[PDB]
Amino acid sequence: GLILQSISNDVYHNLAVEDWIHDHMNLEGKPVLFLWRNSPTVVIGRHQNPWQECNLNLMREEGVKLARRRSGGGTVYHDMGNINLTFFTTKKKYDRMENLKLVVRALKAVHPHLDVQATKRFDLLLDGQFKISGTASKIGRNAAYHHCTLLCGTDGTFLSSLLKSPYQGIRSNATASTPALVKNLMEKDPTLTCEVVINAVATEYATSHQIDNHIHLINPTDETVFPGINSKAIELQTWEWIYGKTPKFSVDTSFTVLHSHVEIKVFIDVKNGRIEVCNIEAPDHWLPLEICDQLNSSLIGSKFSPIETTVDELHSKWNILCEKIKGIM
Numbered sequence: 131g132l133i134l135q136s137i138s139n140d141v142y143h144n145l146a147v148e149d150w151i152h153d154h155m156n157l158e159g160k161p162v163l164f165l166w167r168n169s170p171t172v173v174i175g176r177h178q179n180p181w182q183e184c185n186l187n188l189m190r191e192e193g194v195k196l197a198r199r200r201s202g203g204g205t206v207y208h209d210m211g212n213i214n215l216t217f218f219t220t221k222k223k224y225d226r227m228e229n230l231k232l233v234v235r236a237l238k239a240v241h242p243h244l245d246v247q248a249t250k251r252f253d254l255l256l257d258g259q260f261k262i263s264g265t266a267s268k269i270g271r272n273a274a275y276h277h278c279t280l281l282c283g284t285d286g287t288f289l290s291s292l293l294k295s296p297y298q299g300i301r302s303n304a305t306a307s308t309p310a311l312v313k314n315l316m317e318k319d320p321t322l323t324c325e326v327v328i329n330a331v332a333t334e335y336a337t338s339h340q341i342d343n344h345i346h347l348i349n350p351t352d353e354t355v356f357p358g359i360n361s362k363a364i365e366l367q368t369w370e371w372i373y374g375k376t377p378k379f380s381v382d383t384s385f386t387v388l389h390s391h392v393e394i395k396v397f398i399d400v401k402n403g404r405i406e407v408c409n410i411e412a413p414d415h416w417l418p419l420e421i422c423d424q425l426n427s428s429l430i431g432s433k434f435s436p437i438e439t440t441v442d443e444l445h446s447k448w449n450i451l452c453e454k455i456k457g458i459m
């Protein structure tokens with residue numbers, strides 16, 4: 131076996147490590163535990179819709195990153211109070227429940243008789259009620275990996291707010307997340323910091339696999355240790371990967387503009403993250419049909435993105451309309 135810990139807090143490089151080990155490491159008789167922490171990041175599953183899963187506006191104005199991982203499943207929040215664990219094995223040795231049991235041992239080592247259980251859907255629940263860990267996994271040609279979270283000191287009130295989407299009128303068959311009551315380990319026992327739990331998990335893994343209790347710190351940007359890793363990190367951070375992989379969806383919504391008032395109806399089909407069909411319908415007593423048709427036509431093929439939409443009475447109405455549209459992206 132082998133225990134690695136990333137020195138980086140950049141989700142995209144840390145995910146690239148997963149890709150890399152998956153692609154390049156011989157895991158036969160040598161499983162790998164990989165420990166990592168990210169800066170503030172919402173991580174959606176492979177087949178998810180981020181407009182459906184999080185408050186993107188609040189994320190942008192707080193500097194919270196969005197990443198899409200290669201495994202399926204739901205949406206979680208990562209910050210420095212959260213530990214990520216990746217158990218790499220051969221496909222034959224893929225065993226999610228074995229890994230979760232190992233984590234339970236580790237937690238009990240630093241807090242004897244901690245009430246943490248693993249459920250059938252691979253969550254870890256604290257005191258039979260509160261989610262402290264969620265699981266996903268990926269199978270490849272040469273390897274399997276199981277990764278999970280571990281909430282030690284994560285901003286729980288901030289977590290809940292970032293994962294509450296304000297986007298209305300979305301019709302999609304993208305993968306849904308499963309909301310849960312969560313808790314931190316440090317809420318139960320203030321000694322269970324990330325550092326303490328990381329060490330506890332490494333120690334347990336070392337004993338379980340009969341290897342030296344040594345964490346090898348690794349640099350996920352090092353092309354000499356990990357040839358080709360920076361191209362993986364680039365791909366993972368492309369708009370095409372993060373947003374463009376979103377399953378087909380439609381938006382059917384409206385908003386009101388002061389004038390009394392005027393209601394504008396918005397019908398937008400979004401495919402591959404790009405505006406495939408666009409019909410913004412303003413009352414022709416407020417804005418000429420040709421002007422709305424201009425706006426609809428210019429949006430076609432454009433990215434469903436609040437950036438790629440910015441670029442006397444009518445000009446003022448246009449701006450109000452553009453800003454409302456920006457606000458749903």
Ligand SMILES: Nc1ncnc2c1ncn2[C@@H]1O[C@H](COP(=O)(O)OC(=O)CCCC[C@@H]2CCSS2)[C@@H](O)[C@H]1O
Nearest residue numbers: 204205206207262263264265277278279307308309310
């Ligand atoms: N960090 C973290 N840990 C545990 N639970 C969380 C977290 N963030 C949010 N949640 C709660 O879980 C649900 C989502 O649960 P759901 O079951 O829908 O999704 C998951 O658990 C997926 C886990 C993915 C783990 C990967 C590991 C390396 S990269 S991300 C969310 O609505 C909140 O209630």
Ligand SMILES: [Mg+2]
Nearest residue numbers: 252253264265
């Ligand atoms: Mg789970």
